[PDB]
């Protein structure tokens, strides 16, 4: 099934696989770091925890939750080393989107773009794949809510309940018959099953600073990062 | 562009797919040549025609000039590169220095640009070989080699190809200083020559002449039997 | 350069050495020798001589047929030892 | 770094360049090709790779494509790579076109193909070209001109060719036949049919199985010729019919 | 075990240079000698065929006006350094308006020597001989394909060359003369030589600043044997 | 628009002996109406046994002999030794052929010990051009020297002309007595002359002053 | 970076490509797909069905036409089909810009194929395992055109792609005869669509573009639920 | 065979053992640290001598980058003093563009590209040099941060590179990271340097110090060891 | 041995091992030793050749008027390097008219082979340049290594058997800081004569000398130069 140096490259085996980006979804697994989203109707709620070595830890580097633009914001998973690196050429990708068209990103456009780098880079091998997992929300008009997640297989696909990373397979298997049915959506609701779904794996129950919750709801289009007061008060609000 | 080693320095004391080259060289069809004071000639065999087609198209021998004959072995291609990079160089010269090309000086190109082409990475050397056969100007002979390491030198008769070893053993005869006394003596050591080497005879033998200021010619299918005719028959006139 | 002259005296007290053969005419002509194939290198002299019906052999009878049997053999194989280690 | 590409340029232990011998290979697999004598007139012949009857066929000529207007050329090989060589020879022929407005002997265009045939043999140890295509056309010159490219960088021209191992049987009857002029288009015609019902394998030599095509030359016209299945049908069905002639020996 | 053609080794050093370095012993027999009258020297032309001309072959080439060059092993690539150097003599003469100095041609040469790499090809096995007289009087040079330099008194080449210079060493003198040294060479040169001698087996090399060029002439190496 | 061609000012001298040479040069710098420095000795040491003239704009001038100078320990670390005279006055050509397309405007004198420690005295022009000559006068001063420097020390001129090698002390109050007659007109010849005396031991620099008035 | 472009993909003994043949193989394990050309126009049908509730039809697609007159289908993965897809609408400017007017079908094949043949002896990786169905109509007779990894393309009719490639169009052989409309054609892409199915008869689970001689249509998995409900 | 060759080639494992190597590497070297408090940051450096082995003061592995921001780094020394180079004319792109001092947290994103890059081609190899970042301005305030061969940007209150690394900055937690005065924490941290990173192993050392924040108002160089001693003024009877 | 491939591919232990064979060749060099006092610097070298009246290859060179450089590794990179020293020497000499403080050239030295170790196919440069230099501050001695790893010392040493050189500095050359040039000249072949065998000389032509200060311009000493430098002294004890 390999041809000399074929299991260190990229290229199709007798069935077509992958040798090297297989190992990137199994890099996703280092550091032990779990996202999940979930879309509501008027709102979209990303949520993800982390973990503290010691109390020399940082506060301000905590954040792994990353912001594209003043509305829109994303989410990585994975190697860190791959994630910076995407993420400022998210950042070259949005200043020149604005810079040259002059008008509002869909963020679908965005995630055509790291489809198709995250590819390139998985066409030669003698470059790294890149591994990374994109996750993004999105804010548009007359689309109602917008949440798309461009995955390292260079395709991009993302919905209401939709979610990468090493546990989310149990969590989103809860999410499909939890979901829908026919649950409706407020704020509350949506970060509710947010932390459900972290307390399918977990249920530890911890204090609102391990955690990193970001949400994007339509009043005020801009996103903002959460402070933990705010989450500390949807805390002792989902406890009956 | 493209980086990688054509051949490493080994140290038997030399190259491994450039001195191994040489058999591409060695496989190939039997060629030999003669200088003279009067008429130049060579020889060529193993033509493998169909001899149901126009073969013309695939002779062994060109011109840059009138005066300079070209005369290759091995595979084609290579020597059709040889011949329109010399074409270049020919032209150059004929541009440059409006008078013919000298001997040394075209065999300095064919020879340090294959080397040049040995030298530079990408760039795989020609698995073929020539010598030429000519006249210098004034009046004077000419005949050289080529090797695929670049490098020239000057005999007194042309034996290579396949069997050199053979048809050097039967220039016994040619070492003689009287031939060639006449363009008949020399076509009829061609013709010895040719009898001998190698496999033959009567139809892939392929060769051409040329005296002095006039331009080489090519025998058809008629005298080449009047001339294996005598030379047969010289063996009758022997006993 | 030099124990291939012990390697062609392996081969002194054989045969009877024509007055006039020399080891440093052939021990410089032979590099990367090792002892097997110049030890037959000698010995191939005696293979054509039976065959050519020469007596004894002269040096110029063999190194014909060593230039050639060294060439011949190293055409094809050129044995790199330093290849086999490295 | 160095271990990874195959050494496809550089030689071999055999003495020659070991990827030539299977790209002879590519060219010897399913290649079905052929060449007539030309005697006031040149055809062509080869083998129709699709057994699909429910495909369009609207392209016309389907392996034969033509370079020039009283000069055309049969292929043989891998379709697209062919196609790149193509339009990169018709192109040469048209840049030569755009430099004396006159057309181009196929001499000096069959070397420039083989000058670049070379290219991905002589450096970078790039795959050489799996495609060998023949010659035809007619020139001020020598009239009818039909080549042969190798993929050794020969042009093996002759005025009946061989290609492929199925037509190596040919040969025989190439020149158990030979003849010149004497040798009739309508003979050459015969010739190849019996060439496809010796080599072929297909039962009563279907017509739509193979490909057939013509040239002639015409003041000022030389028209390439594609011609209607009507007169390849009667055709083989008369060249065999010849055949039920042609054992009365008995 | 080819990695990078580049590798060096554990010892060590350069794989294919080193390589090369032992593929000179393969060479012709040269032996130049350095003497207050002029600098001598002398190559055999290892006849390979009694249909051989003289003329066509010769492991001595001229740089400069009374700078020579010898060549050792494969040749093409080293005839290429010869007119190379040549058209740094000339641009030494542009601005310099005088002759090259013979001291100077390791930096025209053995600077250049081996600048082969895989990007932006390969190194030689060819070693050189520098004869020459400048300002200071006569000087035997000689280099390595590698590029180090080193000044010798007498240097030899190819196959003879550890031979040839162990032999020399008893022979060799501070007042060893012109005509000494050719003739004390050739009883070396007729030892090293397989062929009867003759005028097509060795040519002579030589550089003077009162006898030139000069170079030797044929016709007179026949005396030279006669003198034998 | 902007001209990169101007004259900063300057006058070049050179007188060569027979074993000895004599160089000379002003030390005014003077553009238009103002006096910018005094002193601005032009005369520049190559090597210990040579010093070079110079003339015309300025920074060409520096920028000139900082390369000369340059190229000097290139040659040193070849060769192991420092360039003849006639070497450096031909490699000042070439560099000077260099720039043809758009050179410099400047003019230059090279003199010093050459092999047998004779003086040097070379025209030099933009273009890289030059020969050797015994005297030459540089600057807008040359109207009336070089007829004088033909008549002394060329030996033209004269009715029934002997000639006799000059003395080293000779040539010196020559150029004193010369440079003052010279200064009634040309304004860019005066205040302080800088001297340089070429001897074969070394070489020696001294300076005579004119009324700054 | 390194820029090898090596060629290293390289003949079989027997004379083929074996990465072209795992190419094949990518292709051969596709999703199912079929197209049908016939008299007014060219349906697409294929087959997209997401890996659990989670994903909708009604974002991303399987099915981007390259034109407004022209559509295309393909098989294996979508990354690549968006690449060639992306190269194919550049490459359509190239052809406006001299033309200034639409383009053939086939015109499309000979330049994309010409590419992709280009990057099998181009370095780094090859046409990978996406096949592309190429449709289109012009000159008042569309086409459907399809090529391969290694260039080769044909024309046809009909033909299945994907899995059970063979078997579906043995049943499309027996079923197409003569010439077919848009209605039957849409039909006996249910049909074929039924084959693997899976997911035929749902408009949530197919996609179906059509062809027409007025230009190319995408009409929403609405009127794939309006034309059969009610399928056949 | 060999899945840890190449940089752009991943292995089973799904990262590359050419980090993983370039990560032991600098545990190899000595103690190099970091610790910021309210008034700036501290660092220090141990020397190890291996003879004399040369004077004092010659190649310290402590670097500058601009008067607000310097370098204590770690690993092999020429490519520390390769990418320190970097780093160092870094800033006076920001300073030709802008004219004020370049923000430490995206002066980090800088290196991260050279390092994360370094390990995408095949071609290069990653560099096997880690270090601290810290600084501190009136206008700014102190941050820490810390980088690996891995390219990762992030920062503790404090930090330890080298043979004792977790056993060196367990204890430092009794430093606080804000209330204390890095002014009397020179020596605090000194006698922690001093105890840890056993020296019976190999007897010869010798001990850098360096400092920047609001004493010296935002300028970044060497708080003197010859004036005030106070490296061993203290830890001599910190062990005993 | 397929991890000690590249330079590109690290050993198992974190480490390149074409570094440590281009450290062999600089060991394979002749033993010379550099050294500075307070006040002046001087460094001695060793001349070797192949055979009898092969002469003497020479290892110190000029480069800079206060900078004297010892030499080992390939001569052909070294004159590489030497060329390219003497376009670091014109740098300063051209812009500001005034020499270079050698401590930010020699890491620009170590920036330059730099980029040699990255890339694949590029090889480190063997390099035995022990580089005495003068700024205003007084002398520097650096050494050299294809890792590019320099330590400013009083002296040091690079060649066979060149740390029992060091062995016998130590106690010796905390003293040798202030005695003045002529003693601290011969005080190097009280190090070289050493590292030299004991079955030979230490003849006048295998030796190489200079002299380097503040105040002093550095020039090759040789030959008759040694002549007081040999004299004065006694052989070793048997």
Not at chain 2, 41 to 51: D, I, P, W, Y
Not at chain 5, 156 to 184: D, P
Not at chain 7, 85 to 107: G, N, S
Request: proline share 3%; glycine share 8%.
């Amino acid at each position: 099934s390999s041809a000399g140096f074929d299991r260190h490259i990229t290229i199709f085996s007798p069935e077509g696989r992958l040798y090297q980006v297989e190992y990137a979804f199994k890099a996703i697994n280092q550091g032990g770091l779990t996202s999940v989203a979930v879309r509501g109707k008027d709102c979209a709620v990303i949520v993800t925890q982390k973990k503290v070595p010691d109390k020399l830890l940082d506060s301000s580097t905590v954040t792994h939750l990353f912001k594209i633009t003043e509305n829109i914001g994303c989410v990585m998973t994975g190697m860190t080393a791959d994630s910076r690196s995407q993420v400022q050429r998210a950042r070259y990708e949005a200043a020149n989107w604005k810079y040259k068209y002059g008008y509002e990103i869909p963020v679908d456009m965005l995630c055509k773009r790291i489809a198709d780098i995250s590819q390139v880079y998985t066409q030669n091998a003698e470059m790294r794949p890149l591994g990374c997992c994109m996750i993004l929300i999105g804010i548009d008009e007359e689309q109602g809510p917008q949440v798309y997640k461009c995955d390292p297989a260079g395709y991009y696909c993302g919905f209401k309940a939709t979610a990468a990373g090493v546990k989310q397979t149990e969590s989103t298997s809860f999410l499909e018959k939890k979901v829908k049915k026919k649950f409706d959506w407020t704020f509350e609701q949506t970060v509710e099953t947010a932390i459900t779904c972290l307390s399918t794996v977990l249920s530890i129950d911890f204090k609102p600073s391990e955690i990193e919750v970001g949400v994007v709801t339509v009043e005020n289009p801009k996103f903002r990062i959460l402070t933990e007061a705010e989450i500390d008060a949807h805390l002792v609000a989902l406890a009956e | 562009s493209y980086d990688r080693a054509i051949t490493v320095f080994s140290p038997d004391g030399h190259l491994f797919q450039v001195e191994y080259a040489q058999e591409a060289v060695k496989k190939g069809s039997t060629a030999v040549g003669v200088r003279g004071r009067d008429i130049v000639v060579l020889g060529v065999e193993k033509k493998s025609v169909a001899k149901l087609q126009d073969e013309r198209t695939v002779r062994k021998i060109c011109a840059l000039d009138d005066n300079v004959c070209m005369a290759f072995a091995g595979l084609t291609a290579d020597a059709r590169i040889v011949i329109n990079r010399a074409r270049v160089e020919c032209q150059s010269h004929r541009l440059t220095v409006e008078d013919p090309v000298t001997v040394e000086y075209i065999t300095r190109y064919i020879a340090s640009l294959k080397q040049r082409y040995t030298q530079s990475n990408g760039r795989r050397p020609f698995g073929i070989s020539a010598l030429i056969v000519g006249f210098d100007f004034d009046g004077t002979p000419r005949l050289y080699q080529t090797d695929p390491s670049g490098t020239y030198h000057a005999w007194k008769a042309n034996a290579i190809g396949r069997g050199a070893k053979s048809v050097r053993e039967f220039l016994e005869k040619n070492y003689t200083d009287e031939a060639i006394e006449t363009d008949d003596l020399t076509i009829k050591l061609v013709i010895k020559a040719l009898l001998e080497v190698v496999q033959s005879g009567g139809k892939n033998i392929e060769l051409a002449v040329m005296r002095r200021d006039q331009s080489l010619k090519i025998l058809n299918p008629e005298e080449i039997e009047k001339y294996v005719a005598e030379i047969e028959k010289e063996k009758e006139e022997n006993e | 350069l030099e124990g291939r002259t012990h390697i062609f005296k392996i081969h002194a007290r054989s045969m009877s050495v024509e007055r006039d053969i020399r080891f440093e005419l052939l021990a410089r002509l032979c590099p990367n020798s090792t002892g097997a194939e110049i030890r037959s290198v000698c010995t191939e002299a005696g293979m054509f001589a039976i065959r050519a019906r020469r007596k004894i052999a002269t040096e110029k009878d063999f190194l014909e047929a060593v230039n050639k049997v060294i060439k011949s053999y190293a055409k094809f194989s050129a044995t790199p030892r330093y290849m086999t280690y490295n | 770094s160095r271990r990874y590409d195959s050494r496809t340029t550089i030689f071999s232990p055999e003495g020659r360049l070991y990827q030539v011998e299977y790209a002879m290979e590519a060219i010897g697999h399913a290649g079905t090709c052929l060449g007539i004598l030309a005697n006031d007139g040149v055809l062509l012949a080869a083998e129709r790779r699709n057994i699909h009857k429910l495909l369009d066929e609207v392209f016309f000529s389907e392996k034969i494509y033509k370079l020039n207007e009283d000069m055309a050329c049969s292929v043989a090989g891998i379709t697209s790579d062919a196609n790149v060589l193509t339009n990169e020879l018709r192109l040469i022929a048209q840049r030569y076109l755009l430099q004396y407005q006159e057309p181009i002997p196929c001499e000096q265009l069959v070397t420039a193909l083989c000058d670049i045939k070379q290219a991905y043999t002589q450096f970078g140890g790039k795959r050489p070209f799996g495609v060998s295509l023949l010659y035809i056309g007619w020139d001020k010159h020598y009239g009818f001109q039909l080549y042969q490219s190798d993929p050794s960088g020969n042009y093996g021209g002759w005025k009946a060719t061989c290609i492929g191992n199925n037509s190596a049987a040919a040969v025989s009857m190439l020149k158990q036949d030979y003849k010149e002029g004497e040798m009739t288009l309508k003979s050459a015609l015969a010739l190849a049919i019996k060439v496809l019902n010796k080599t072929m394998d297909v039962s009563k030599l279907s017509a739509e199985k193979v490909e057939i095509a013509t040239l002639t030359r015409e003041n000022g016209k030389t028209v390439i010729r594609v011609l209607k299945q009507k007169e390849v049908e009667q055709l083989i069905k008369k060249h065999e019919e010849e055949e039920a002639k042609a054992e009365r020996e008995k | 075990y080819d990695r990078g053609v580049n590798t060096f080794s554990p010892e060590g050093r350069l794989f294919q240079v080193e390589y090369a370095i032992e593929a000179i012993k393969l060479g012709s027999t040269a032996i130049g000698i350095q003497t207050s009258e002029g600098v001598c020297l002398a190559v055999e032309k290892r006849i390979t065929s009694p249909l051989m001309e003289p003329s066509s072959i010769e492991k001595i080439v001229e740089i400069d006006a009374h700078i020579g060059c010898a060549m050792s092993g494969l040749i093409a690539d080293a005839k290429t350094l010869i007119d190379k150097a040549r058209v740094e003599t000339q641009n030494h003469w542009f601005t310099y308006n005088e002759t090259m100095t013979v001291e100077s041609v390791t930096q025209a040469v053995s600077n250049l020597a081996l600048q082969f790499g895989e990007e932006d090809s390969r190194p030689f096995g060819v070693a050189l001989l520098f004869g020459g007289v400048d300002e200071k009087g006569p000087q035997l040079f000689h280099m390595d394909p590698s590029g180090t330099f080193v000044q010798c008194d007498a240097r030899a080449i190819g196959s003879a060359s550890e031979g040839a210079q162990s032999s020399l060493q008893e022979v060799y003198h501070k007042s060893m003369t012109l005509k000494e040294a050719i003739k004390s060479s050739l009883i070396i040169l007729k030892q090293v030589m397989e062929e009867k001698l003759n005028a097509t087996n060795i040519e002579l090399a030589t550089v003077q600043p009162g006898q030139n060029f000069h170079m030797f002439t044929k016709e007179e190496l026949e005396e030279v044997i006669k003198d034998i | 628009r902007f001209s990169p061609y101007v004259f900063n000012g300057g006058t070049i001298l050179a007188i060569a002996g027979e074993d000895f040479a004599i160089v000379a040069s002003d030390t005014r710098l003077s553009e238009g109406f103002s006096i910018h420095t005094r002193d601005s000795p032009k005369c520049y040491k190559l090597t210990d046994k040579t010093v070079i003239g110079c003339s015309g704009f300025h920074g060409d001038c520096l920028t000139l002999t900082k390369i000369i100078e340059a190229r000097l320990k290139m040659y040193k670390h070849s060769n192991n030794k420092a360039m003849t005279t006639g070497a450096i006055a031909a490699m000042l050509s070439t560099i000077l052929y260099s720039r043809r397309f758009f050179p410099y405007y400047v003019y230059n004198i090279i003199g010093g010990l050459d092999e047998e420690g004779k003086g040097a005295v070379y025209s030099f022009d933009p273009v890289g051009s030059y020969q050797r000559d015994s005297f030459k006068a540089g600057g807008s001063a040359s109207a009336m020297l070089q007829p004088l420097l033909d008549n002394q020390v060329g030996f033209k001129n004269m009715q029934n002309v002997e000639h006799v090698p000059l003395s080293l002390d000779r040539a010196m109050r020559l150029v004193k007595d010369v440079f003052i007659s010279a200064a009634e007109r040309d304004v860019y010849t005066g205040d302080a002359l800088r001297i340089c005396i070429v001897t074969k031991e070394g070489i020696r620099e001294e300076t005579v002053s004119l009324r700054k008035d | 970076e390194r820029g090898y472009s090596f060629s290293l993909t390289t003949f079989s003994p027997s004379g083929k490509l074996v990465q072209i043949e795992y190419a094949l193989a990518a292709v051969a394990g596709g999703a199912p797909s079929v197209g049908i050309k016939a008299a007014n126009g060219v349906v697409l049908a294929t087959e997209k069905k997401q890996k659990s509730i989670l994903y909708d039809e009604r974002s991303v697609h399987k099915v981007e036409p390259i034109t407004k007159h022209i559509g295309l289908v393909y098989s294996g993965m979508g990354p690549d089909y968006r690449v060639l897809v992306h190269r194919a609408r550049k490459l359509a400017q190239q052809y406006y810009l001299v033309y200034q007017e639409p383009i053939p079908t086939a015109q499309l094949v000979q330049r994309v194929a010409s590419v992709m043949q280009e990057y099998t002896q181009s370095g780094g990786v090859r046409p990978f395992g996406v096949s592309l169905l190429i449709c289109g109509w012009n000159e008042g007779r569309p086409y459907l055109f399809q090529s391969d990894p290694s260039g080769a393309y044909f024309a046809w009719k009909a033909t299945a792609m994907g899995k059970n490639y063979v078997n579906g169009k043995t049943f499309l052989e027996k079923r197409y005869n003569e010439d077919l409309e848009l209605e039957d054609a849409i039909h006996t892409a249910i049909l074929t669509l039924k084959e693997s199915f899976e997911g035929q008869m749902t408009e949530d689970n197919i996609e179906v573009g059509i062809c027409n001689e007025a230009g190319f249509r995408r009409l929403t998995p609405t009127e794939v639920k309006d034309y059969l409900a009610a399928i056949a | 065979t060999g899945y840890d060759l190449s940089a752009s080639t991943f292995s089973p494992d799904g990262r590359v053992f050419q980090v993983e190597y370039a990560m032991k590497a600098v545990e190899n070297s000595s103690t190099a640290i970091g610790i910021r408090c309210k008034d700036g940051v501290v660092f220090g450096v141990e020397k190890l001598v291996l003879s004399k082995l040369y004077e004092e003061g010659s190649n310290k592995r402590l670097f500058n980058v601009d008067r607000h921001v310097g370098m204590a780094v770690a690993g092999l020394l020429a490519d520390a003093r390769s990418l320190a180079d970097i780093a160092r004319e870094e800033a006076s792109n920001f300073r030709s563009n802008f004219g004020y001092n370049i923000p430490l947290k995206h002066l980090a994103d800088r290196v991260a590209m050279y390092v994360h890059a370094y390990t995408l081609y095949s071609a290069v190899r990653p560099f096997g040099c880690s270090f601290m970042l810290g600084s501190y301005s009136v206008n700014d305030g102190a941050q820490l941060y810390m980088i690996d061969p891995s390219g990762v940007s992030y920062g503790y209150w404090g930090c330890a590179i080298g043979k004792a690394r977790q056993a060196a900055k367990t204890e430092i937690e009794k430093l606080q990271m804000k209330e204390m005065t890095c002014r009397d924490i020179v020596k605090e941290v000194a006698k922690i340097i001093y105890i840890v990173h056993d020296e019976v192993k190999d007897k010869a050392f010798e001990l850098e110090l360096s400092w920047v924040g609001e004493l010296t108002n935002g300028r970044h160089e060497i708080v003197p060891k010859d004036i005030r001693e106070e490296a061993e003024k203290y830890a001599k009877e910190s062990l005993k | 041995n397929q991890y000690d491939n590249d330079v590109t591919v690290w050993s198992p232990q974190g480490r390149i091992h074409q570094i440590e064979y281009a450290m062999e060749a600089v060991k394979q060099g002749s033993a010379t030793v550099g050294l500075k006092s307070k006040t002046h610097a001087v460094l001695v070298a060793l001349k070797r050749a192949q055979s009898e009246l092969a002469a003497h290859q020479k290892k110190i060179l000029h480069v800079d008027n206060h900078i004297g450089i010892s030499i080992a590794g390939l001569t052909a990179d070294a004159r590489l390097l030497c060329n390219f020293m003497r376009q670091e020497c014109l740098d300063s000499r051209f812009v500001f008219d005034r020499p270079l403080p050698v401590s930010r050239l020699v890491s620009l030295i170590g920036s330059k082979t730099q980029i040699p170790t990255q890339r694949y196919g590029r090889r480190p440069y063997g390099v035995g340049l022990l580089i005495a230099g003068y700024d205003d501050m007084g002398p520097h001695i650096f050494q050299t290594c294809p890792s590019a790893n320099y330590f400013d010392c009083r002296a040091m040493s690079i060649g066979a058997r060149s740390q029992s050189a060091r062995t016998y500095l130590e106690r010796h050359m905390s003293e040798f800081m202030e005695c003045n040039l002529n003693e601290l000249v011969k005080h190097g072949l009280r190090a070289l004569r050493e590292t030299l065998p004991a079955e030979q000389d230490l003849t006048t032509k295998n030796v190489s000398i200079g002299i380097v200060g503040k105040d002093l311009e550095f020039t090759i000493y040789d030959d008759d130069d040694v002549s007081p430098f040999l004299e004065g002294l006694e052989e070793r004890p048997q």
